[PDB]
Design a protein. Structure first.
Length: 259
């Protein structure tokens, strides 16, 4: 927890990291309780809330949601192909997670009573910090003192534990959720690029395109054993997307030396 301070100086802005090993209780990080904008990382608790409602019989992964032209916004590469028809909830979950389909998240949110319902879901599972207030794209707005669409590195690391390793979800739902993060397509130049060999990575990313990039991940040891959880938030950085990706890569390098 001193390498992160040195790394934060390179970034500019605020760097929040939480590396947690639940089986042993080891914890490393920096600004672990400060609030950072979630950006697209809000899609991970969004998918878990969907699966939890599915496990409760109040929703089905095979029910289909209509897609109209008004639902399409920027960076929605899968939902834009289904204007005038429908898509299964399962495919909407996959699209919003592995490629960060923005419209797919706006179509999943009303199924769990919107951002207010997502916050109510997070509070019921034990997360009293994370606040989900808006949908895409305005959830990327952030200002100090404004807790809307924010989380903490420790809170999101705990959510990774509850939904992937805990018993919040059914064994089939939590394994499907892990498989989605493993199939992520947007994190090759971020945490994955710095993490060492011998670990399976599942992650979800986020970015505002100017000064904020986030990446939360689960670290399964390929040689068997208990997994780690790594949340990383970088807000207000002076580096652009490629530079912030380099900071996220170095976070993976620092975490790899602590495994």
């Amino acid at each position: 927890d001193a390498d992160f301070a040195t790394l934060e100086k390179t970034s500019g802005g605020r760097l929040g990291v939480c590396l947690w090993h639940p089986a042993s209780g080891a914890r490393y990080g920096h600004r672990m309780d400060e609030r950072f904008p979630m950006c697209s990382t809000v899609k991970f608790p969004l998918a878990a809330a969907i699966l939890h409602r599915v496990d409760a019989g109040k929703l089905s992964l095979d029910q289909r949601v209509a897609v109209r032209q008004g639902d399409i916004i920027s960076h929605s590469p899968f939902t834009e192909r289904h204007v005038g028809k429908d898509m299964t909830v399962r495919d909407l979950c996959r699209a919003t997670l592995i490629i960060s389909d923005n419209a797919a998240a706006n179509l999943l949110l009303p199924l769990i009573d919107g951002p207010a319902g997502l916050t109510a879901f997070l509070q019921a599972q034990g997360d009293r910090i994370t606040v989900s207030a808006r949908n895409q794209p305005e959830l990327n707005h952030f200002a100090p003192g404004d807790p809307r669409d924010t989380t903490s590195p420790a809170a999101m690391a705990g959510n990774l534990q509850r939904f992937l390793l805990g018993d919040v979800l059914s064994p089939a739902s939590r394994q499907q959720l892990a498989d989605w993060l493993i199939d992520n397509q947007t994190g090759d130049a971020r945490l994955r690029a710095g993490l060492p060999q011998g670990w399976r990575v599942g992650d979800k990313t986020g970015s505002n395109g100017q000064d904020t990039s986030n990446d939360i991940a689960a670290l399964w040891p390929l040689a068997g054993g208990a997994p780690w959880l790594l949340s990383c938030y970088l807000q207000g950085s002076a580096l652009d997307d490629d530079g912030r990706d380099g900071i996220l890569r170095q976070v993976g390098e620092l975490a790899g030396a602590r495994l």
